[PDB]
Every structure is written in C-alpha cells, then in structure tokens.
Amino acid sequence: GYTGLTDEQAQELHSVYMSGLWLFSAVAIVAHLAVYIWRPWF
Amino acid sequence: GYTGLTDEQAQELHSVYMSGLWLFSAVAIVAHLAVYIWRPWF
Amino acid sequence: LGYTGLTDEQAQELHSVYMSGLWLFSAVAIVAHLAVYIWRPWF
Amino acid sequence: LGYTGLTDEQAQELHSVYMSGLWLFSAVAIVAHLAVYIWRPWF
Amino acid sequence: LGYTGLTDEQAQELHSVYMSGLWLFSAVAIVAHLAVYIWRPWF
Amino acid sequence: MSKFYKIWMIFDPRRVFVAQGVFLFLLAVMIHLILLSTPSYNWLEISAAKYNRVA
Amino acid sequence: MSKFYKIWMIFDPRRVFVAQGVFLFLLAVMIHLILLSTPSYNWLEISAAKYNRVA
Amino acid sequence: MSKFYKIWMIFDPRRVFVAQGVFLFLLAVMIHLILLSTPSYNWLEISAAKYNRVA
Amino acid sequence: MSKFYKIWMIFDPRRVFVAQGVFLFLLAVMIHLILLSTPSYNWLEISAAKYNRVA
Amino acid sequence: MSKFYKIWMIFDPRRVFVAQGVFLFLLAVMIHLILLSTPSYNWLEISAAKYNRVA
Amino acid sequence: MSKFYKIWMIFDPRRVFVAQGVFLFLLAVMIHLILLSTPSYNWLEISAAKYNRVA
Amino acid sequence: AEYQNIFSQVQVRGPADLGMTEDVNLANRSGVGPFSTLLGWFGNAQLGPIYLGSLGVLSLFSGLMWFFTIGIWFWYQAGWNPAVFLRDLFFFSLEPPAPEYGLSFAAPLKEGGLWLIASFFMFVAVWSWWGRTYLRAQALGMGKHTAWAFLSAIWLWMVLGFIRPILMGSWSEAVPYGIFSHLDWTNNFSLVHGNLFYNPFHGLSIAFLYGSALLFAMHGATILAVSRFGGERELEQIADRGTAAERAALFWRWTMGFNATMEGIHRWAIWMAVLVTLTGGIGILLSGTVVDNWYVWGQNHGMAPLN
Amino acid sequence: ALLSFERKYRVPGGTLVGGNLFDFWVGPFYVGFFGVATFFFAALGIILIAWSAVLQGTWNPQLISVYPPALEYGLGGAPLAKGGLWQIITICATGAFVSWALREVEICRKLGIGYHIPFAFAFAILAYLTLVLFRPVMMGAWGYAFPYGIWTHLDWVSNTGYTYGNFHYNPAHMIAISFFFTNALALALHGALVLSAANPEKGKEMRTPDHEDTFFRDLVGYSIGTLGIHRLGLLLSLSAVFFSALCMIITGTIWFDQWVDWWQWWVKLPWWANIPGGING
Amino acid sequence: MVGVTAFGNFDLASLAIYSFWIFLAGLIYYLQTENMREGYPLENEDGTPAANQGPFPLPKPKTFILPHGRGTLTVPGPESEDRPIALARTAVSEGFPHAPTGDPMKDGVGPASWVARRDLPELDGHGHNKIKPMKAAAGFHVSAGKNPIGLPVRGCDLEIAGKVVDIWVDIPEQMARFLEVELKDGSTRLLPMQMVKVQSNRVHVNALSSDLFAGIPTIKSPTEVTLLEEDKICGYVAGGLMYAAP
C-alpha cells in the first residue's frame, strides 16, 4: 500500500481514529438532543 | 494494469469499497424515509 | 518512530503534559462560563 | 535529550526564571486590575 | 553554555549596567509623571 | 456485474476517493441549499411558523 | 465493516487528519453562523428578549 | 482512547503547538468581539448604563 | 504541572520569548485602544469632564 | 528574579539594545501624539487660553 | 458492430471514462435544472400546492 | 514558428535546494516546501524554504491581526450571514473616524475605533516587514537596495494613512479598508482637490508608472531575445561580459542611439520604479495642505487656459 | 564612433526591404529602409504640430493642442484647421510607430537575436490604434479620439471616464491596473535584487544567483528564478496593455451606462438577492 | 500654507516641482555615466580613439571582487578585442558595413560573433560546476514535458543530423540548458536549449541545416563547458539564421 504502512500499523491506527470518532459523535449526539429539547426544529 | 493492483488486490479492495457504499446508501435511505414521513414530495 | 521520530516512551510522556495543559485550561474555562452564566444566562 | 539540545537541567533552570517573571508580571497586572476596579467597576 | 557566546560573568557585568540605565531612565519618568499629575491630574 | 472491480486496475483509488469525496459533498451542499431556498422545505423557516417563533 | 482500516494503507494519516480537522471546523463555523443569522435561532437575541435585556 | 498519545508519532508537536495557539487566540478574540457587538452582552456598555457613566 | 519545564526541551527559548513578547505587546495596546474607544472608560475624556476642561 | 541576567547568554545585546531603542522611541512619540491630539491636554493650546494669546 | 471493442485500442480507457463521467453528470444535472425551471415539472412546487404547504 | 523561450519545454527536478548559508541563522529557516509542476513551466518549481525569526513573527502576527480585524468587521456588517458576506464582500468597508473626532482616539468602536485598531496592526506589520527586508539582505552580505526600494513605497503608504491625516488634522482624511471604498476614496479625493490630473507630481508619478511598464517590457524582451546566449545569467554577464550583453547593448544603441550595461540597466529599473511612489507621495502630501484646487493652480502656472 | 566591441557586428544584411541601398549607419543610429520612413513621418508629424501651434495662436508648449474633428464630421475628412491636421498627424504617428517596429525587426536580424522587442512594442501600437482608430471607427466619429496636447489629452481621459461615472468600476480597467501596479513592484524588486548581488557590502565578493534565490526564498518562501523574472516582467507589461485596450474597446460600444451599475449582476443573483442585511439588503 | 507664495506664483508646490527637475537632471547624469563602464572610450572603425567622445565623461573606476578566487574586475578599463576579426571595409567612409573576408560562421563575425570570455566553467555558490550533464548529477531527472533523450535531431533542411543523448542541466537553477547531440560520426555537440523545438517525434533546429552540425565548436572536456566554449557554441548556432543558405 502506498502509505508504506504494514497492515499491523493500519489496524493499530484505525482503532485510535475510530475511538476518537466515537467520542466526537457522542458529544454531537448529546448536543443535538440538548438543542432539540431547548428548541425543536421539527 | 495501469495501477499495478493485482487481480486479488482489486477483488479485495472492491469488496471493502462496496461495503462502505452499501452502508452509506442505506443511511441515506433511512434519511429519505424519515423526511418523506415528515413531508412527502411526491 | 511513526513519521516524526518520537518514541513510544517520549510521546506518552509529552501527551501527559499536553493533557495537563488541556484540563487546566478547560477547568478555568468552566469557571469562566459558570461565572458569566450566573451573572447573565444566555439560555 | 530533546529537540532543542537543552538538557533536562537547563530546561529546569530556564523554567524557574520564566515562572519568576510570569508571576511578577501577573502580580503587577492583578494590582492594576484591582486599582481600576476600585476606581471604576466594570461589573 | 549559551547561544550568544557571552560568558556568565560578562552577562552579569552587562546586566548590572543595563539595569542601572533602566533605573536612571525610570527615575526621570516618575518625576515627569508626578509633575504632570501635580500640574493636571488625569484621574 | 462480476468484473466492475477491474475499475481499480484502471483508476488509482487515492485519486478516486478524493474526487468522490469532493463530488458527494458538493452534491449534498447543492441539495440542502436548494431546499433552504424552497419555502415549502426550509426547515428553519417551517419550524419558526410551527412554533410561532417569529414576531 | 471490519476491513475499513486498510484505508490507512492508501492515505497518509497526516494529510487526512489535517484535512478532516479543517473540514469539521469550517463546517461547524458555517452552521453556527447560519444560526446566528437566523432570527428564530440566534440564542443571543433570544435570551435578550426572554430576560427583557432589550431596554 | 488510551493510544491517543501516538498522535505525536504522526505530527511534529512544535507545529501542532504553534498552530493550536493561534487557533485558540483567534477563536477567543472572535467570540469576545461578537459579544461586544451584541448590545445585550457588551459588558462595557452594561456597566455604563448601570452606573450612569454617559449623560 | 511539574513537567511543564519540558516545553524548553522542545521549543527554542528565543523563539518562545520573542513570540510571547510580541503577543503581549499587541494585546495590551489593543485593550487600551478598546478602552480609549469606549466613551465610559476613556480616562482622558473622563478627567476632562470631571475638571471642566475642554472635552 | 536574581537570574534575570541569564537572558544575556540567550539574546545578543546588539539586537536587544536596538530593538528596545526603537520600541521606546515609538512608544514615547505615540503617547505625545495621543496627548497633542487631545484638547484637554494639548499644552501649547492650554497656554494659549491661560495667557489669552488666542485671538 | 462487433468491432466496436477496437475503440479501446485507440483511446486510453482512463481518459474516456473520465470524459464519460463528467458528461453524464452534466447531462443529468442540466435536465433536472430544466425541469425545475418549468412549473409544469417543478416537483417541489407541485408538492407545495398538493399538500397546501404555503397557505 | 520557432521557440520563443516563454514557457519551458522540458522540466528537470534535482534534489531540494536549501540555498546559501552565509550568516543566516539556520535554525530559523524552515524545511523546503513541495515542488509545483505548474510553476515549473514559467519559473522555478520549488516552494520554500522560508526564514522566520523575530521580525518575521512580529510582522506575520500583526499582519494576521490586521486582516482578522477587518474580516470580523465584514462578518459583522454581513450580520454574520454567510450568504450576505459573499454577496456584499466588495461593498463592506471599515471607515476611519468621522471628521468631528479630529485626530482624537475617542471615536466609538463602530464609528472609527476599529479602524484605528486595524491601522495600528497594519503599521507594525509593514514596518517590521521593512526591517525584515533589511536584515535578510544583511545576513547574506547583500546590498540593501531592496530595503531602500521598499522604503519608497512605504513613503506613499505613510502619506496616505498617517502623515497627511495628521497634517490635515483628522483621521477622516485616511483611506477606508474595503475593495470599492478605497476606490470611492480615490475618486472623491480627486474631486475634492479639483482634478488631480493637474497635480504635477501625479503627472510625474504616472510618467514613472508608464515608464516602468515601458522599461520592463524593453528589458524582459531584451533578455529573452538574448537568452539564446545565456543573457538571463546577468551576474556572470556583469563579471565576464559575453556576446549576450554586447548584442543587447548594440540593439538599443542602433535603435535609439544610446544603451545601458548589464549592471546599469538595473539602476534605470530601480529608479524608474522607486520614483513612482516618491513623486506620488509628494503629490498627495501637497494636496489640501498647499493646493486645494489643482486645476486653478494649473491655470496660474501656464498649463491650463485661463477663464 | 563605435563601442570598443561593436565593429565585429557591423556586417551587411538582415534588411527586410532595400537590400544595401539603406544598409548603413548614421552615427550610432542604424538607418535602413524603415529608418528613412521613420524619420520622414516623425519630422512631418512634429512639424505639423508646430504649425498647428501657429494656427492655435500659442507658443507655450503645455497649451499647444491639436483637436480631432468635431462629431459633426463623422468619420469623414475635416478642414485642416478644424480637425484635418489631427488626422494627418495621426497618419504620421502610425507611420512612424510601425516603421520603428519594422526597423527593430531588421536590427534583430542583423544581430541574430529574438524578435521579442518589436513584438512587445507592437502591443503599445495596438493600444494607441485602439484609442485613435478602432474605437472611434466603432463609435462612428473621429471626435471620440483624444487630442494631441500635453494637458488636453488628460481632459479627454477625464471627460471620457466620467461619462460612465467612476471609471474605477470598469472590470477590465481594474485588471489592467492590477498588472500595472504588479509590474512596477516586480521592476523595483528585480532591479534591487540584481544590484544587491553585484554591489554587496563593502569588501565582500560579488554574490551569486544562488544568493539571489536564497534571499527571496528567505523573504517570501519562493523564487521565480533568473529566467522566470524576465518572462514575468514581459508578460505583466503586455497583459497590462492588453486589458487596457480591452477596457476601452468595450466602453461606449457594448457598455453605455454607469460602470458601477454593472456590479449589480452579482448582488442580484437570485439565491441571495433578497436576503436581508449587509450593505445591499 | 494654501495660497502662500514667496514671489509671483511661486508657492511651496512650485518649490517642489523645480527642485525635482534639478534632482532629475542630476539622476539622469548619474545613470548615464554608470552605463559607460563597458564599451568606452569610443573608437574609430580602425580602432583609434574617436575625436568625439560624447557629452558625458567616463565615471571613476569601480572594482568588482569576484568569488572563488577569480580575482578582481575594474571597470571602465583597458578593453581590447583580444582576438582577430576577419572583417574588411566595404567603404572608405565611416558608417558602412564591413564584409566577412572568409567564412563568417567559422571566423565568428556578425551574428556568429563570440567573445573571449574566461576559459573556465561558471560556478555555483558552493563552487561546483554550475552546468553539468544530467547523468553526472544523480538526483536529476526529467520531471515533466517531452523527454528529448533518444529523439532524432532534424535540421532546417529537414534531414536528420543526429540524436539527443543527454541534457546538460543548470544545477542551482534546475533547468535544462543544452541538448547533447550525437552526430553521424559519433562525436557529440552541445545545442543551446533556446534554439531547438522539442516536437512530439523530433527535435527541430531551425537555425542549422543538417550538414552544419559538424561545424559546431566542440567542448574540450566531455564533463564541463567553459564560458568561452558556451559563447562559441551559442554564437555559431545563432549565426546560422543569417548564414545557413538553402
């Protein structure tokens, strides 16, 4: 692969990236709930 | 082969690409159903 | 290692000092927000 | 030992005087804010 | 030890002179501020 | 259907995924802006009426 | 769904990480600015009425 | 989460710390200027009316 | 906090002292100019009124 | 505080003395400019009234 | 009609497939934009009346 | 048709080129940037490296704060609406204080206070860039011609925004920050002062501005015409005059009866460009302070017909 | 008299017309067929200007002004005292400028250099002919051309500009100005950089083009190079004059109103024309 | 200050404009005398000093100090041709052309002229040979554009003169400066890159007929080219535009 990474490295890398994305998504989901409770857009 | 991808590399890489396409397009259909339930265009 | 040249040992310590900065900065930001909210709520 | 070529001791030497300077500057600033607040409160 | 290639003793000599120049300058500065305040207060 | 995967022997997936990312994002931006431009679908303006939030 | 990690064999994480970082910021700012310009959703002008700060 | 520190194997922390500092300062300056532009939140004007410092 | 001193192991001390000096100068002037531009806090125009000087 | 002198092994006196000499001059001129632009403190114009040299 | 496969001996498949992709997008979007340009087929405004969404 | 040497036919790429050291403090120089194949058709392909250091940081931070201060005012004038911001982008304007405030710093933030704050960051950014342009030459042992050339542009800019407002007695005389508004200012300036065409230093400034297009067209065409002899390598033609420099000299001697040298044409070049903003700055400094109607001044000085 | 290196280049040939009939020099000046043509038109045009000064009744060189025919004369001939001298002097100017370019082509041939110089000069000729010939012919009257007079041609610039409001709003005029200012910037920088290398600090050796590359990379992170800068200075100058000619050929032929009103097409784009706030809302 | 005159109409804007005319006359005198550091004093066609030297005097000498130990140049200075010139007068009067007495391409006169430049390579800032064959600089490669190496070289007579075997690159400037052409006797020549058109299937050299390529002055070292050699090559090729007959 054209990043030179071994597969082992890409698996390691993806686990950190997705854990960051799950954390970011969790805060966003709460933020939309709080705003929808505060002031629904539907 | 212009990209140098072996037949096995292309048969692998396509399978992951399709998996993402089906996931993305599925989520889009859920979104369309909800917005149709909210406000049918047809 | 990786792409920079930091090791696992070096990076794992640097990150702890970075996060010590993050939480300290964030804690003051919480105090600032709560003080402003008690003074003048924006909701 | 780091990128800068300063040792772990040189980095502590310089940090000790940096904080000596920071605390003095902020102490004078704190006094300046308190004087101005007594003169003319902004809250 | 250092970037400039001053010695530690050359630094102390130059600093002792620099600080004395600063104190002579600021001493006049105080006298000017106090004179203008006595002439025409700004607070 | 079985052979469409040979597209990856022609186009290098790096260039494809960048071009596809731009394409799909700008297409979504087109549609949402068309809807925000549309009185029957501007969801913020609809919600305002539904909850009396204007004037 | 399991094999997605092989994307990091295709793109340099430095480029992707910076690109998604800039994307998320510019998208978030754009949305907050759409809301601040929307009178029914400008929280600063809402709370000004709710607490009669307009006088 | 426990592996987040491996970001410093990907990015030179000198460049990240410089970039982060100017990001934070510009963001904070923008928020304060937004609130000074906001009449209900301009603290310099709020105190002026509270203490009758104009007229 | 005990290891904040390792900032000097990663950043050149001249670049830090210059960058921080530059920052504090521009910030301090900006705030004094904001207060001169504020009718309730311009100390020169305040004292001019307080002592019936031309203002 | 007793090691404030340690700066001179870090910064060259030729650079520092010129940089500070330029700084202090422009700060002084800036303040005299600000006061001369202020009618309550223009010392030449104050004298014109105090001694009635005006008209 | 059998020998239409010969085209790929003359035109590079990459440089044809790019040309086809751009062409089909442009043709589709042009038609959808023309349809929205006619009230006879603007599916948003047909729907607005049908569901009484603007009254 | 033959090759004109306007775009390169073949690009070659070696290693990255880090450049001369001399007395450059090499810790302050970045890594080399990427190569651009697009730029390589017309000039060099290599981006970077760049030197930062102290006057660099000062200039870049103050210049960022200048730009950011204007941008936020434009976002405010847009009412934070991202669509209005792009519709009215050329119509936004950060105006100087109103005339009643004179030179006093007492104008409100919306009535000219932000213009003073913006102008202060511009002042520091431009002047620190000047010192940076001086010191980068010093570190390489070069002449200071570039810093003294830049001082001529600063002279006009200082006259427009600083000196003439002070001599006129109000910041309302200064230029607003905005695309169409500095154009409206430029037009209004000429109308208030009675047609700036009859200012003789605006006439001179235009002569040198046209002369700069004349002279760079002549010089650029000359060097490309002799580039087949390596005439673009002008320093080696100064040190060791080749047939390129002689053919260039004889073209102009046979055309117009006199000629330059490879070193001396760059003195014509620097002065032709420097005199644009030197005479320009004088012509603006005289406007309103010494002459309030240039057309009538023209009538009294034998360049317009009397009434 | 010759430059000390000049003799080896004064060979026969390269003439486009006339062979050796005019293949000689007069002092430094090369003659040739078009040098004879050039001098005739130049002398005639100058002398008809001095005669127009007699008819006008002034000897102040700053008041001398040769006006084109009034608009009532259309594109036809006018009386010599009343526009006909301007027409002949315009013929002489065109004859002189074109002959001068063609004389430069001959000098290029004799020296074996590229034709870049006469080609670049042909852009100035086309800008001149735009203002005196092509645009007046499009608009239907010689009176839309400018008068030959030091200050009176500035009255034409003023009166032509203010016919369309503030002329800063002509979008091609904005592009031309941007090239004119950028060209003058680049000429200041290029002159200074070459001089700063050939004339270093006292006692130092001459700097190399490596120092020139290094200074600009240190200053701005890029360096166009010795060849790039001369390409740039040429193309910036020529682009400035191309967009100048373009801005005028459209003015009064396809655009007639206040140029400021053109920019409303952007403001009134229908996705944002009605959105409240800003300057236009 | 508005309207204030010392005398007549002479206000402070008059003082400015008159002061500028004095400065401009001084600057123009400075600029022209600076431009007399090459090619002066003026000569008669025989080479004797011309009785008319013009209105401006020669400037005082300046000395350039050359890098890499190559000495110092003083200008103006003694400035002989330092080579034979194979020209003869076509008239007794001054101002007429001088005709080539033999073969002007090989005698190096007219557009074929060349100058006695230094017989050493031009150097970069480090003091390496500035121009090198690309094979001798290992990092270099053709990064875009039609690679000419391996193309046949065609003359203006439309016959093949040889093939391109290397590119000679300017190292600091990173640009292609010559094409090396291998002739039908296997000896090579350098062609100036600005004199050739790299077409899709050929390199076209519009200055030379295919026979004239053997006359191109050859370099003495196969790995470097001196400034003298460059001038001889570049002069010879450009001379072909006048002197290559059909």
Ligand SMILES: CCCCCCCCCCCCCC(=O)OC[C@H](COP(=O)(O)OCC(O)COP(=O)(O)OC[C@@H](COC(=O)CCCCCCCCCCCCC)OC(=O)CCCCCCCCCCCCC)OC(=O)CCCCCCCCCCCCC
């Ligand atoms: C609105 C602003 C404009 C603004 C206009 C633009 C202003 C900004 C640009 C300034 C450019 C400066 C020009 C310059 O450096 O001149 C010195 C240089 C030195 O050349 P040289 O070769 O080293 O020495 C002279 C001599 O050895 C040349 O050879 P030779 O003697 O065999 O032949 C003589 C030449 C021409 O020489 C002359 O005409 C006499 C010297 C002129 C000096 C001008 C400056 C100083 C005196 C100024 C006041 C002289 C008062 C009498 O060839 C011939 O004579 C052959 C016949 C053709 C020429 C016929 C001319 C007919 C008379 C027309 C009037 C000419 C007036 C100069 O070249 C010359 O002498 C000849 C220049 C001819 C073209 C000059 C064009 C520039 C404008 C006029 C001169 C500058 C003053 C404004």
Ligand code: BCL
């Ligand atoms: C109706 C309009 C008026 C008029 C009003 C004015 C006014 C008013 C002025 C001019 C001026 C000029 N006019 Mg006029 N002008 C008119 C008609 C003309 C015509 C014409 C064909 O009709 C022409 C060719 C000109 C030509 C010119 C120029 C010769 C001259 C500007 C020189 C220059 O370089 O400025 C451009 C250069 C600068 C402004 C210097 C800038 C330097 C600073 C330091 C740059 C800082 C950069 C900043 C920090 C951003 C950085 C970004 C980077 C990416 C980091 N005018 C008519 C009569 N003109 C000026 C002058 O000098 O008058 C005598 C002037 O002030």
Ligand SMILES: CC[C@H]1c2cc3[nH]c4c(c3C)C(=O)[C@H](C(=O)OC)c4c3nc(cc4[nH]c(cc(n2)[C@@H]1C)c(C(C)=O)c4C)[C@@H](C)[C@@H]3CCC(=O)OC/C=C(\C)CCC[C@H](C)CCC[C@H](C)CCCC(C)C
């Ligand atoms: C002699 C007359 C001519 C002249 C000369 C001239 N100008 C000059 C020079 C010279 C000789 C220089 O040496 C100097 C130069 O450096 O040129 C390359 C300059 C220059 N002329 C300039 C412009 C200019 N010159 C002009 C004109 C002229 N220049 C005349 C024609 C004009 C116009 C309108 O005609 C302009 C606009 C600049 C290119 C340059 C001066 C640069 C300067 O002072 O910049 C100050 C501002 C900054 C350093 C930064 C601004 C903000 C940036 C966006 C950087 C932000 C960085 C930050 C870290 C980003 C962080 C983002 C976060 C969100 C992460």
Ligand SMILES: CC[C@H]1c2cc3[nH]c4c(c3C)C(=O)[C@H](C(=O)OC)c4c3nc(cc4[nH]c(cc(n2)[C@@H]1C)c(C(C)=O)c4C)[C@@H](C)[C@@H]3CCC(=O)OC/C=C(\C)CCC[C@H](C)CCC[C@H](C)CCCC(C)C
């Ligand atoms: C295209 C880019 C720029 C350009 C390029 C350019 N000009 C050039 C060249 C080049 C490359 C030449 O080779 C050529 C030259 O030889 O330069 C020394 C030339 C030249 N550019 C000149 C001038 C010039 N260039 C200008 C502009 C520009 N030149 C462009 C901006 C301008 C203006 C106003 O912008 C002027 C005044 C000359 C120095 C020269 C051409 C000389 C020439 O043609 O000589 C033969 C003619 C005469 C000696 C006299 C003719 C007299 C007439 C018959 C009578 C006068 C009529 C005229 C209309 C009167 C106008 C009165 C004014 C008050 C309006």
Ligand SMILES: CCCCCCCCCCCCCCCC(=O)OC[C@H](CO[C@H]1O[C@H](CS(=O)(=O)O)[C@@H](O)[C@H](O)[C@H]1O)OC(=O)CCCCCCCCCCCCCCC
């Ligand atoms: C063996 C050869 C046989 C040849 C046979 C005869 C052929 C004769 C016809 C020639 C055809 C082309 C003529 C041009 C187009 C045309 O019809 O024009 C007719 C118009 C008349 O329009 C008139 O009418 C115009 C309207 S209209 O065009 O009729 O609709 C109107 O706008 C204008 O005001 C009015 O004057 O006149 C012109 O256009 C003027 C021509 C000018 C030529 C000399 C220029 C001298 C002035 C100074 C400029 C010098 C420039 C120097 C350049 C080197």
Ligand SMILES: COC(C)(C)CCC/C(C)=C/C=C/C(C)=C/C=C/C(C)=C/C=C/C=C(C)/C=C/C=C(\C)CC/C=C(\C)CCC=C(C)C
């Ligand atoms: C108002 O109406 C309009 C004007 C808007 C009408 C518009 C009409 C129109 C022209 C619409 C066009 C729409 C089109 C053409 C849409 C196409 C959409 C597509 C093709 C979407 C595809 C999405 C694919 C996705 C999300 C794929 C993701 C893949 C993933 C996550 C896997 C990545 C990882 C790998 C491939 C692993 C790598 C493997 C190895 C071996 C290294």
Ligand SMILES: COC(C)(C)CCC/C(C)=C/C=C/C(C)=C/C=C/C(C)=C/C=C/C=C(C)/C=C/C=C(\C)CC/C=C(\C)CCC=C(C)C
């Ligand atoms: C009004 O609102 C708007 C309309 C403008 C809308 C705005 C909405 C919006 C999009 C806001 C976005 C905000 C974001 C994205 C904020 C993010 C902030 C972050 C990422 C903050 C992080 C802070 C971290 C700090 C303070 C860390 C400090 C670390 C320090 C001091 C130590 C550094 C480490 C070392 C010295 C290492 C030492 C060890 C070794 C071994 C060298």
Ligand SMILES: COC(C)(C)CCC/C(C)=C/C=C/C(C)=C/C=C/C(C)=C/C=C/C=C(C)/C=C/C=C(\C)CC/C=C(\C)CCC=C(C)C
């Ligand atoms: C529009 O928005 C508003 C302006 C209204 C609000 C903006 C709010 C905002 C974003 C503020 C941000 C503030 C921050 C981040 C402040 C940080 C301050 C710090 C870290 C200050 C540290 C100061 C340290 C000082 C002054 C001293 C150090 C001394 C040292 C290291 C000893 C060596 C020095 C000497 C011996 C002095 C030698 C003499 C000279 C003249 C250099």
Ligand SMILES: COC(C)(C)CCC/C(C)=C/C=C/C(C)=C/C=C/C(C)=C/C=C/C=C(C)/C=C/C=C(\C)CC/C=C(\C)CCC=C(C)C
């Ligand atoms: C009034 O309104 C209008 C103006 C719009 C009126 C109509 C105007 C007008 C003239 C319309 C004309 C329309 C035309 C010309 C339409 C043509 C459409 C075409 C050309 C459609 C073709 C579609 C082809 C497709 C989707 C092909 C896909 C191929 C695929 C997926 C596989 C590609 C092959 C491989 C991956 C195999 C690679 C093999 C190896 C060995 C590596």
Ligand SMILES: COC(C)(C)CCC/C(C)=C/C=C/C(C)=C/C=C/C(C)=C/C=C/C=C(C)/C=C/C=C(\C)CC/C=C(\C)CCC=C(C)C
């Ligand atoms: C303005 O908007 C409208 C009104 C017009 C509506 C339409 C707008 C629109 C079309 C929105 C579309 C939004 C989209 C496409 C959003 C996509 C968001 C994404 C892709 C978010 C991803 C976030 C990922 C995050 C936060 C990941 C963080 C990863 C972290 C923290 C860890 C990184 C990994 C490492 C450090 C690796 C360590 C390991 C090794 C081996 C070194």
Ligand SMILES: COC(C)(C)CCC/C(C)=C/C=C/C(C)=C/C=C/C(C)=C/C=C/C=C(C)/C=C/C=C(\C)CC/C=C(\C)CCC=C(C)C
């Ligand atoms: C550059 O890269 C690195 C990696 C090194 C990152 C560096 C990041 C870094 C370390 C930044 C440091 C930032 C600092 C030092 C921030 C400090 C912030 C502080 C201390 C903020 C304080 C804010 C306080 C506020 C907003 C308080 C507001 C209170 C209000 C509005 C109400 C007050 C009410 C009354 C007075 C009324 C009742 C009482 C009385 C007496 C009447």
Ligand SMILES: COC(C)(C)CCC/C(C)=C/C=C/C(C)=C/C=C/C(C)=C/C=C\C=C(C)\C=C\C=C(/C)CC/C=C(\C)CCC=C(C)C
């Ligand atoms: C995307 O949104 C963001 C917010 C992120 C960015 C938006 C960026 C943006 C839209 C920027 C817009 C910038 C514009 C349109 C700038 C226009 C500038 C123009 C045309 C300037 C023209 C002339 C300026 C002159 C002549 C200024 C001269 C200033 C001088 C000489 C400084 C004099 C100094 C003072 C008066 C200050 C004195 C103060 C003290 C304390 C002594």
Ligand SMILES: [Fe+3]
């Ligand atoms: Fe040059």
